[PDB]
Design an enzyme around this catalytic site. Sequence first.
Site, short mmCIF file in Angstrom:
data_model
loop_
_atom_site.label_atom_id
_atom_site.label_comp_id
_atom_site.label_asym_id
_atom_site.label_seq_id
_atom_site.Cartn_x
_atom_site.Cartn_y
_atom_site.Cartn_z
CG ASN A 191 18.71 6.34 14.68
OD1 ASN A 191 18.05 6.54 13.70
ND2 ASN A 191 19.80 5.59 14.67
CG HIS A 225 12.38 1.95 1.02
ND1 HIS A 225 11.02 1.81 1.16
CD2 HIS A 225 12.71 3.12 1.64
CE1 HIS A 225 10.53 2.86 1.81
NE2 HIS A 225 11.54 3.65 2.13
CD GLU A 229 10.05 -1.10 0.08
OE1 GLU A 229 9.56 -0.96 -1.06
OE2 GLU A 229 9.99 -0.21 0.93
CG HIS A 247 -2.11 1.04 1.01
ND1 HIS A 247 -1.94 2.38 1.32
CD2 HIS A 247 -3.40 0.91 0.60
CE1 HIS A 247 -3.08 3.03 1.09
NE2 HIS A 247 -3.98 2.16 0.66
CB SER A 305 16.16 5.84 0.89
OG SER A 305 16.40 7.22 1.13
CG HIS A 343 10.68 0.52 16.54
ND1 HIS A 343 9.61 -0.36 16.44
CD2 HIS A 343 10.84 1.05 15.30
CE1 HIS A 343 9.19 -0.39 15.18
NE2 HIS A 343 9.91 0.45 14.47
#
Lengths: 262, 262, 262
Positions: free
Chosen positions: A225, A84, A87, A62, A202, A237
Amino acid sequence: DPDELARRAAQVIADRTGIGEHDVAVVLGSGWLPAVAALGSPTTVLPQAELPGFVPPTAAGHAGELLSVPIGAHRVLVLAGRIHAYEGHDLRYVVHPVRAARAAGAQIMVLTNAAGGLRADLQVGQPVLISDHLNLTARSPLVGGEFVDLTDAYSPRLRELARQSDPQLAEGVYAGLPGPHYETPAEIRMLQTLGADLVGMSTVHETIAARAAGAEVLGVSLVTNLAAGITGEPLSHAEVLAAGAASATRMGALLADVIARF
Amino acid sequence: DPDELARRAAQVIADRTGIGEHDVAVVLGSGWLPAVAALGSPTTVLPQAELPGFVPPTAAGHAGELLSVPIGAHRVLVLAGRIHAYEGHDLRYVVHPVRAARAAGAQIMVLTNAAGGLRADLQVGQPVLISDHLNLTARSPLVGGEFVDLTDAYSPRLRELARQSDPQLAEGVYAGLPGPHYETPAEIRMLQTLGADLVGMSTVHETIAARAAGAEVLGVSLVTNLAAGITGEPLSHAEVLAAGAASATRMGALLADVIARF
Amino acid sequence: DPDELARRAAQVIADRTGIGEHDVAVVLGSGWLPAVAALGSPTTVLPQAELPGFVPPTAAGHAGELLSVPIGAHRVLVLAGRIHAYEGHDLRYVVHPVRAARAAGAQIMVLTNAAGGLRADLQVGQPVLISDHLNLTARSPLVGGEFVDLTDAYSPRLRELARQSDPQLAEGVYAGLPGPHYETPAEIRMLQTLGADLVGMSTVHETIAARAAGAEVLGVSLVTNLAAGITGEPLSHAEVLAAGAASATRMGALLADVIARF
Ligand SMILES: Nc1nc2c(ncn2COCCO)c(=O)[nH]1
Ligand SMILES: Nc1nc2c(ncn2COCCO)c(=O)[nH]1
Ligand SMILES: Nc1nc2c(ncn2COCCO)c(=O)[nH]1
C-alpha cells in the site's frame, strides 16, 4: 543463551529435515506467504512451533512453518511465518529464527516484509530491495556489548545479484517501526523526512541479529500500500492484505533465481 | 525504591571512603576508562559490586571500580565501569550511580562517553562537550510525575569552564540511542537531519536522572570514530576500541583540569 | 482479553449510572481536571478505582472519577484523570478507560491533554485540536493483529463540528513522547523538523486504542507552555499542571459546547 538455543533449534532442524546444513534462509512474513510455494518444492515441512526457541511461550496462536527447499546445491531454510515484536515477544524470540537459521548453516538471510511506500514513484505490489534501514523501534535484539557495524547491513553484493535476475528492481530505505498500528499521515511525513522509502513493522531486528551473526542479508519489501496520507484516501485492508500477493508470487520465484546466484 | 537505594549507596560510600561529600561525580564510559589513571590521587577504591544497588539482578559481568579522589577543591566520585541500558538492565540501575552520586554530595556529574561523530569535521580521538541531547531511546529513568525541565540540561556554565581548560573543545548535540548495535548510514543521515552532531549509546538517562536530582551535568564525548556512512567506508572495531587508550592521559588531564575549575 | 475487560468495565458503568450507553467519553487529564464541574451536572459519580481494569495495588496514590453527564444530545462518560505510560503501567491499563468507554457505547472519545506548543502561532492557555499525531513512544497499545489505519486518527469531521462551537480552535500535530521528563531544546528542534506542533506525554495510545476499537477521537491539547528552547527559558510541571486551570469555566464550557455539536 540465544546462541546455545539457536544451536538446539539447528540440531532439531538437521534431525527433522535430514539435511545437515542449510546455507540460505528466507524469512517470509506478512505479504509474502505467496512466496513460499514459489521458492520451490520442499523436501521437509515442519512446524516452527516445534522448534526449540521458536513460537513464544506466553501467547501460542499458530506459527507458520519451516520448509527445507533445495535450490540447486543450496539448501534453503524457508521460514514461512515470523513473529513480531508488536506481539509482546522479547526480541530474543523475534530474532531466534534468524539465529537458528544461522546455526543451521545459513550464509545469507533473505528477509522479506510487507511495507507501505513512503515515496512518490511507488506502486502497490512493487518489490523493493532494502538498501538500508531506519530502526525506529528504540530497541536492539542484541544484549550486552555486541557492537555490530550496520554498514552495508543489506549486502550490496546481494542487491547486485538480485538485479541480475530483475534489473528493474528498485531499492529503498526501510523504516522499521514497532507497530502493529499503521502509521498516521504525520508519521509518514516524518518518515519521508527521516529518509525512509518504505515503512513496516518487522525486519530491522532480524537484520541486526543476522549481521551480528556474520550473515549477509538480502532485504525485500513488498509495497502492500502507499503509506497513509500519500494518496488522500484511507488504507484499504483488502489491498494491504492482497494487492501484493501475485507480487509475492513472482518474487518467490525471482527469489529462487537469486538464491541460485548465491 | 531507587532514591532510597541511592541514599543507601551514598551512606556506604561515605562510610567506606571517609568522605562525607563528593561534590563531583565522573562516570567513565567506553573509551574513558584508561583516563582513570590520570585523575589524581584517589584515596579509596572500592568495587562497585560492593555498593548497594550498583550491580543489577539480571546480568553479572565484573562491575567496575568506584574511586574517591580529591581534584582541586572537590571530592570526586569516579565510576570506572558502568552498566548500560543495552545490557538488559532496568534504567534504575543505569542511573543509580548518578543518583547515588548526588545523594553522596554530587552537584556536578561529569558524564563521558564514546560517540560516533556526525559532523565529518569532528576528529577521531577529540573530546566534544555535549551542549544538548536527543534522547532517542523512548525511555526515561524517571517514573511517575517527575516533570523535569531539561533546558540547559548540560550546564552552559560548566561548558564555559571546560573550555577555559581547553578552548579547542568542540561542543555538539549528542543523540543517545539504545545500542548496542551501531547505526546504519541511513540512521546517521536521519541523526544529522535531527540536529545531532554526536551519536552514542548512553548518557541521556544519566543526564536526565542528574537534572531530576538537581545536579548539573558536564557531558563529554570522545569521538571514537566518524559515524556510519560518513567516511564512505565501514566503521572499524580496530579504531573504536583503541581510539582513547591513545587519548588516555590527555583525557584524564582534561578531566582533572576541568574539575579543578569547578 | 482487553476487550472482555473493557466489557466488564462498561457493565459497571451501565449498572452504576443506570444508563445503558454513553455515546461520548471525555478523558480529562493534566490541565483539564479543573474543567469538570463546568461540563454539566453529573447524574452519577463513581470512583475509577471501583471499576474493573482501572487502578493499581503496587503504587497507589488517589484516583479519578468517572462521571456521567448529559451534554447536548449526549450521554457523556467523563473520565476525570488518567494514568500515563510514564507511571510505568502496561499500556493495556493506560487505554483501558478508552476501551471501557468504547464498550460503554462511546463512539467518540474526546482526549484532552496538556502539551508544549512548538508552532509559532500557538500561545500558553490556548486549546488546540489535535489534527494528527506522531507517536514517538516506540510502543503501541495494540498487540497481535487487528488492522488499524490511523489515517484520520483525529476525525476531521469531529474537528469541523468542534469548530462549529469555537471556530477559534487551532489544530496541530501532537508528538506523543514517553515522558515524564520534558524535552531538551534540541529535541524540540527535532520535533519541529518532524512536523510536530505540540508535544506531550499521553494521548497517542488512547487514540490508537480508540481507533482500533472503532471510536472517533477528538484530541484537545491545552498549550501549557511553549516547548523547551522556544522562550529560551525552562519548563514547568505546573505552569503545565494548569496554565489553563487559570480558565476552568472556559475549558469545561468549551468541551460541553464542542461535544454538543457532535
Ligand atoms: N507499518 C506499515 N506496515 C505495512 C503497511 N502496509 C503493509 N504493511 C505490513 O506490515 C508491516 C511490515 O513491515 C504500511 O503502510 N505500514
Ligand atoms: N551509537 C553509537 N555509538 C558509538 C559510535 N561510535 C562510538 N560509539 C560508542 O561506542 C562505545 C560503545 O557504545 C557510533 O557511531 N554510534
Ligand atoms: N512532553 C511535554 N509535555 C508538556 C509540555 N508542556 C506541557 N506538557 C504536558 O506535560 C505533561 C506533564 O504535565 C512540554 O513542553 N513537553
